[PDB]
Design a protein around this ligand. Structure first.
Ligand code: FMN
Length: 377
């Protein structure tokens, strides 16, 4: 029976264990160019047969909603990524690039020519939420501009190009970021999408954009090199759906149908879940969310990655009970470069410092968290 530390065939790829580096924005790619800091960060976290998912990576200039996040839409960016990917591969890692467009979760200071961010809607994120600005202050999310149909197709093309560029950089595949209230989620969630055209209304219409993206990148680089991340039950930055269960199942039904039509499976479905503890890890002393995650996994035909507040014990149980094939860890991987070894040994985990999640130093709070002492053989 599978355990968290068992080998796994993720279609094309052989993994040696089920512990995954969750995608995490860290803002060390100064002026959007992957650099020596990113090389060392991913190298430190690489293991033989371990799966890595990168930080969200811009597909276009309008994709930006954080400072110093990498892109993969220029040759210069691709050349920077090659060095990261080569180092991870030297350690035996498998690595996917997460393709990211923030949509309305942006600010004029991040947009070319100071243009309004783009979205499904003209409705801004409410003032309940604020955005980190490049000068280390927090600002107000502005009114976005609703995309026309032809402009949505332009963004689909941006995803296609980014996927091709990822393969040129040597990535094993890409992950479509369709979670956390960003552009594709702004179309999926009925709390945001108030369109009256073919991209609004029904679940079919609301899932249209993300399915067009999946279809385009699958054609470009192959189904087996494409993963997809969603979060139907996370309502971060005013991104709520009235029926998360049905939304998740609607995406899944369409992924299943596409796989059947094309004749092959996607690399995986990746779902991130909310937690209800004070620190956002583990479970309290909702079963609703747990049931939802198992329902979605049961419905999806293929590899399922779970993420969000997983602990060593909950990760062990998720794989042992068949709730997930792979378990991704975010915050613990920030502070534990050798997280896989620590989980295998049930060693203590380094505390993580939220204050340097999104700062820009190549060392401080980024690559200077220690591994366990390996000694000298
Ligand atoms: C600093 C930080 C940056 C993150 N950046 C991304 C991102 O770029 N793309 C994404 O899909 N999720 C991102 N996440 C969400 C994580 O992938 C993960 O789902 C979340 O941290 C919950 O998992 P955890 O409990 O193991 O930390 C980020 C989380 C943090 C804390």
């Amino acid at each position: 029976k599978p355990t968290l530390f068992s080998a796994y065939k993720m279609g094309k790829f052989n993994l040696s264990h089920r512990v995954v580096l969750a995608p995490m924005t860290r803002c060390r790619a100064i002026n959007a160019i992957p650099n020596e800091a990113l090389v060392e960060y991913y190298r430190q976290r690489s293991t033989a047969g371990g799966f890595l998912i990168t930080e969200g990576t811009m597909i276009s200039p309008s994709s930006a909603g954080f400072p110093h996040v990498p892109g993969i839409f220029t040759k210069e960016q691709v050349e920077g990524w090659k060095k990261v990917v080569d180092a991870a591969h030297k350690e035996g890692a498998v690595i996917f690039c997460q393709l990211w467009h923030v949509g309305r979760a942006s600010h004029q200071v991040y947009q070319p020519g100071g243009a309004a961010p783009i979205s499904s809607t003209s409705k801004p994120i409410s003032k309940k939420w604020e955005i980190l600005l490049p000068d280390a202050t927090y600002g107000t999310y502005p009114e976005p501009r609703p995309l026309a149909a032809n402009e949505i197709l332009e963004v689909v093309e941006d995803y296609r190009v980014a996927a091709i560029n990822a393969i040129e950089a040597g990535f094993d595949g890409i992950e479509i970021h369709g979670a956390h209230g960003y552009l594709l989620d702004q179309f999926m969630k009925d709390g945001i999408n108030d369109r009256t055209d073919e991209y609004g209304g029904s679940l079919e219409n609301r899932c249209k954009f993300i399915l067009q993206v999946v279809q385009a990148v699958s054609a470009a680089i192959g189904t087996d090199r494409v993963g997809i991340r969603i979060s139907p039950a996370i309502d971060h930055t005013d991104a709520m759906d009235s029926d998360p269960r049905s939304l998740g199942l609607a995406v899944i039904e369409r992924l299943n149908k596409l796989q059947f039509k094309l004749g092959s499976r996607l690399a995986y479905l990746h779902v991130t879940q909310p937690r209800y503890t004070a620190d956002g890890h583990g479970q309290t002393e909702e079963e609703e969310v747990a049931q939802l995650m198992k329902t979605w996994r049961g419905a999806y035909v293929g590899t399922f990655i779970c993420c969000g507040g997983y602990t060593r014990e909950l990760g062990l149980q998720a794989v042992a009970q068949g709730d997930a094939d792979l378990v991704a860890f975010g915050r613990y991987f920030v502070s534990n470069p050798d997280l896989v070894l620590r989980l295998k040994l049930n060693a203590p985990l380094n505390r993580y410092d939220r204050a340097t999640f999104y700062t820009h130093d190549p060392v401080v709070g980024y690559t200077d968290y220690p591994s366990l002492d390996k000694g000298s053989l």
